[PDB]
């Protein structure tokens, strides 16, 4: 029953011609609900979840103004960082930003985040106390000194503990049928001979939400990691996720092996056996 709101910004310079490509996306937990793309036709923040579509014109106007401002900020900062790193005007570079808030089952602030990257590596991040910054190198240290003198952390903190939490609460209510639902995994096992003497058992988890899940194999009641393989959790494309875990076993010994499934949607972990 804990929840999160996160926004993700990616700005990529294109020296061959025009402004950076800027893409912003917003999430509640594992559900995307808004987007902005500088190259799309609307030039508006756009809905990507049915439950946000009820917000009024005033909402979209405010979100569009703020996200367009952020794209210009990123444009400027791409030029500044190119200079800090003594880079040429000729190449493409990337700024990424993530921020947002976590709340407990009670709806109250738990944690806030704000962190920034340059060309895929840490640049500057707000620490968990929301009062201090971690700068990865001497370029980011410049930013850190400027942001401390400007008291940026105070303003970030006020948003993360304030409006971030308040709007996450509103969205959880307006979208509750989906956002406050847990969908436990639909599970089954398959069996695939490799030879006359060995077979693959594959434990499947489908249709679950949220994405966090754990699949574990045991043999005769004890965890087994040897001879196992698993795929990374992956989106089905319909708002649910999928995962599998497999183990190779001596043919005939299948009944010694159990797959154990943990998910927030399951009040007790599930156990499957061939």
């Amino acid at each position: 029953g804990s929840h999160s709101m996160r926004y993700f910004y990616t700005s990529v310079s294109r020296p061959g011609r025009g402004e950076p490509r800027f893409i912003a996306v917003g999430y509640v937990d594992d559900t995307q609900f808004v987007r902005f793309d500088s190259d799309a036709a609307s030039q508006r923040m756009e809905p990507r979840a049915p439950w946000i579509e009820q917000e009024g014109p005033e909402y979209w106007d405010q979100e569009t103004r703020n996200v367009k401002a952020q794209s210009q900020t990123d444009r400027v900062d791409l030029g500044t960082l190119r200079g800090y790193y003594n880079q040429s005007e000729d190449g493409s570079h990337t700024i990424q930003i993530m921020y947002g808030c976590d709340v407990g089952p009670d709806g109250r602030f738990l944690r806030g985040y704000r962190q920034d990257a340059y060309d895929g590596k840490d640049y500057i991040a707000l620490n968990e106390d929301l009062r201090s910054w971690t700068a990865a190198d001497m370029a980011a240290q410049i930013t850190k000194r400027k942001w401390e003198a400007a008291h940026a952390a105070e303003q970030q903190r006020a948003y993360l503990e304030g409006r971030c939490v308040e709007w996450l609460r509103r969205y959880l209510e307006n979208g509750k049928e989906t956002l406050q639902r847990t969908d436990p995994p639909k599970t089954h096992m398959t069996h695939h001979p490799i030879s006359d003497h060995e077979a693959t058992l594959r434990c499947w988890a489908l249709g679950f939400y949220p994405a966090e899940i754990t699949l574990t194999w045991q043999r005769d009641g004890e965890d087994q990691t040897q001879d196992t393989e698993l795929v990374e959790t992956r989106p089905a494309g319909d708002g649910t996720f999928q995962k599998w875990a497999a183990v190779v076993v001596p043919s005939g010994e299948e009944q010694r092996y159990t797959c154990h499934v943990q998910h927030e949607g399951l009040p007790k972990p599930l156990t499957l056996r061939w």
Binding site: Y7, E63, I142, Q156, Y159
Partner: peptide, 10 residues
């Protein structure tokens, strides 16, 4: 809703 528009240059 996103953070307020307030420019803190890097």
């Amino acid at each position: 809703a996103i953070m307020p528009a307030r420019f803190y240059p890097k």
